Amino acid sequence: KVFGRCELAAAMKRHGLDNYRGYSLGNWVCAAKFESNFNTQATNRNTDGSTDYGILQINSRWWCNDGRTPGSRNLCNIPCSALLSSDITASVNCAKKIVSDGNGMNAWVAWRNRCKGTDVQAWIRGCRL
Numbered sequence: 001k002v003f004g005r006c007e008l009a010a011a012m013k014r015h016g017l018d019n020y021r022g023y024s025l026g027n028w029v030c031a032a033k034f035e036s037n038f039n040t041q042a043t044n045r046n047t048d049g050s051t052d053y054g055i056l057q058i059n060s061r062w063w064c065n066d067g068r069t070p071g072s073r074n075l076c077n078i079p080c081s082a083l084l085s086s087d088i089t090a091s092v093n094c095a096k097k098i099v100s101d102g103n104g105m106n107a108w109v110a111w112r113n114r115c116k117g118t119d120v121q122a123w124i125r126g127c128r129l
């Protein structure tokens with residue numbers, strides 16, 4: 001599923017991401033824009049052989065099981081395929097664990113390089129929320 005901006009803002013809010021660990025909703029919407037272009041089915045292989053999955057590009061090295069990341073963990077206790085669903089519940093629940101992990105949203109390289117220190121509220125501007 002390819003979400004619209006406001007449509008995702010609304011779904012993220014409903015799943016309790018808004019100001020989760022102090023990160024305002026625009027942060028999450030901005031991260032999803034630049035991680036996945038709002039596409040739940042996005043996948044990208046990393047040079048280390050791990051793969052990033054879903055609207056928030058969650059990595060198989062630590063967070064989910066894809067059966068081909070030798071030596072990896074599954075700290076979200078999910079198949080990485082769960083992160084590609086049209087329903088964002090699994091991705092949200094897993095993101096909440098990640099952002100609790102110690103470095104906050106810096107875990108998302110795209111957030112650090114494209115969202116952090118920008119006007120992230122712009123990503124929710126005009127949305128009925």
Ligand SMILES: [Cl-]
Pocket residue numbers: 065066067068069070071072
């Ligand atoms: Cl694996």
Ligand SMILES: [Cl-]
Pocket residue numbers: 021022103104105
């Ligand atoms: Cl933080």
Ligand code: NA
Pocket residue numbers: 060061062063064065066067069072073074
């Ligand atoms: Na894994």
